[model samples]
Target: NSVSVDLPGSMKVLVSKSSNADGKYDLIATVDALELSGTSDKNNGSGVLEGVKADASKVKLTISDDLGQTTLEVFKSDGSTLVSKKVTSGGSSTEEKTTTEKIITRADGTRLEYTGIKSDGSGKAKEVLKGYVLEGTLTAEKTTLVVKEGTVTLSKNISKSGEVSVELNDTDSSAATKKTAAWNSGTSTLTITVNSKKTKDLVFTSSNTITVQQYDSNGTSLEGSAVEITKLDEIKNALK
Candidate 1:
């Protein structure tokens, strides 16, 4: 009763059975590849989604069922009950359509997790983030992500086989191991797999907290213990 499809432009679609505040739903949209402006090569063979922009409004999603077909609305992460912001392309307002529904609920089970963009009072577009905030000064070879736990230094190097890779080292640990990383832009979740045995999921449930989901090859979540980190402002300026 579940199917995962990889669409063009790195958009992932999962049609499954999941319930939200309303009822059952049909599908979910996950945008996994939103590279930064000039950091395309940072995503080498390491599988880490290096630099992601905070603005999520560029990705458009629609929901259709027996209830009707309409554009899905995105809410703020701070639990604010605000509607959709300025989504027009140009500086002026052009495509301010009608209000469909904030939460799209079908009889099945479907939920859209893409946090969209919002406009400021000064007519400037302010970005809202539901994931680890990556806004920092980065070079061609190195960039450090400073979390509350410690710093995760990322380095770019080419192997003898001419394969480029990103090396990740956690400063807090005695051993700086090479970990495989994947970032899901829609749900704002980063999964790190080590030696194909253990997995650590850094889940950004909100803008203020980082919940660690640690598990093992046997799918047991209690394999290891982890510390929670909350360094939103520090992480935003980590690369600097």
Candidate 2:
């Protein structure tokens, strides 16, 4: 038998525009997946007790965009296709492309790394400015998930002479107030979510939000930001 899983909630979409300007832009989506398992036991015909078994499966999502049409594809580590759907562009134009790949569970159930790049539509892909790779651990209790402890690395790809500003926004409605962080030239935003409560829910929650903005080496804000939220519960229930 096979199972299908949608992209997790933590994944965020970022948009960036060109500094020189000509209507060219880049778009990106970043998200992390964890290895999950379900318990099972073997019952022999002779009624002898057998050992327990588990499955280590990872969730992954791939998104492709051309002009204004966007395609979202989801898959499992076992090479099974889960979801393949296309969404009509709510508008025209493309801006900023960011990809976040992170390991939510360690090989032995410990630390995780959520890292990716925020780039412009210029130079070799590697030469593009790679954004911060935030590394954190998963803390889980009951049904809540949080980022227990870790550090965030913020980096930029500016060559000549200019200023690049980094902005971080925390959109937790339950919290007393939203949090925002600013960095100039280096990594700075480091936070810890307790007991995996927030982080865990973030993995499956329908409406979790995260916004990151990067200024050009010339201090200009990118235009035409886009974000699309995929409802996994609706998709999964539809399969039944």
Candidate 3:
């Protein structure tokens, strides 16, 4: 996450109190060390001031997990205090869920769910499947769910789709990726793009459904474990 701060006054209170030059010094910052105290120190202590910066120390906290009430009081890169936070992720969870299911939860409580499977078999059969599901709670509006080691997956899809090829990895469950093989096996990465930096970010859709795709470890109506990207785009970009 990117950060910025406006020095209401000077900040010589840091390393060399002599550097605390007064005046509104507009500044930007970067995230520093992360604490496990459920809450995080973000503003003055944890996050670093940059181009567009304060702390007299600042914090933006994050709840880390179910480990109970924790607090993350961050200090400057040199051990000062600021406030910040975010947490809550992977835990023990679902094997094969219904056509609908969430695999990961963010510190903000958003979910990463999926459905529709596609695959190309592994045995001598050399059978094939399809690709048809890739989605997310663009906004942290979806209901929260459980996380597990198996959360990260390795599905397959037929390798005969048109226009372009696709790939899906355990990126959705990267939080617990270490507990399993999702991030270990193949080349899988996850990323999300949004219109804004604030919260509750998913776009709205009349169908309340997105025809995305998810290929299995290896499809038919759409060969190569490929789902229609244009179709996915149609549903993914709609607004409420």
Candidate 4:
């Protein structure tokens, strides 16, 4: 069969402002994370027969700020925490405060939650709390339902008897050059147009579908694939 994964987190923040500021100084912050998890079916003659592998990742961080000052922190796993910092504003009558944070995930699966805190050392340090959870499969097995590269091409006249042709040229230049002008009533062909520009050449560089057999390594075809053609615009764009 097939397997799927998911991740989920939350954060909260509090802020305060100076009395001399023209506007109310409020601190705001948030913290969140993702939980990755997945499951597979064993009856479909697929997937690992034994224990399933799993792992977790982060999604966001938290930050807070007050009049002219700010604070930031990053959240990784469920139990992670952040320590607050202090800042000061000059004699500028226009007191302003703000906080910011950036969450980053590295190639090695490590997560960094960072936060910037700013404030006029005269006031109390605002508090911010943020956390997250990671959940997902560490190992996912490949399935037998794979796709083999193929192509499909138009073989006969495709225009309606009384339709007027629009003049807009919106298709890929390469596809337009290789496209065919005619398509048979019920016949279609598949072709690889990786480097050619034929309007009628249907490129199938990627696999469509493949079914495996129980007794042999080679896969067998169970059903014929069908491409639905509903509009001329679609056809035009496809050929272009």
Best by TM-score: 1
Give the range of the ten consecutive residues with the poorest summed lDDT in model 3: 120-129
Give the CA lDDT, 0 to 100, for residue 66 in model 4.
23
lDDT of 1 at 112: 21
Question: Model 3, 237: alpha-carbon shift in Å?
Answer: 40
C-alpha RMSD between model 1 and the true structure: 23.4
How does each model score on TM-score?
0.26, 0.16, 0.16, 0.17
In what order do the candidates fall by TM-score, top score first? 1, 4, 2, 3
lDDT of 4 by residue, 66-121 (tens): 22222222223342432232222332222223544445554444343334423211
As for lDDT, the candidate ahead, 1 or 3, is 1
Q: Scored by CA lDDT, what does every candidate get?
A: 0.37, 0.27, 0.25, 0.26
Per-residue lDDT of 87-202 in model 2, one digit per residue for the tens? Answer: 33444333333344444453433332433522111221121111212222221111111221112222222223322232233444544333333342343222223222111011
Predicted model with the maximum lDDT? 1
lDDT computed for candidate 1: 0.37
Q: How many residue pairs clash (N, CA or C atoms closer than 3 angstroms) in each of the candidate models, in the order given?
A: 7, 20, 74, 51
Q: List the residue pairs that clash in candidate 1.
A: 24-108, 24-109, 25-108, 25-109, 25-110, 26-109, 26-110
The TM-score of predicted model 1 comes to 0.26
Flag the better candidate by TM-score, 1 or 2: 1
For model 2, the stretches where C-alpha displacement exceeds 4 angstroms are 1-12, 15-28, 31-67, 84-86, 90-240
- Candidate 3, 35-75: lDDT as tens digits: 12111232232222221014223343322222222232333
User: Would you give me the overall lDDT of model 3?
Assistant: 0.25
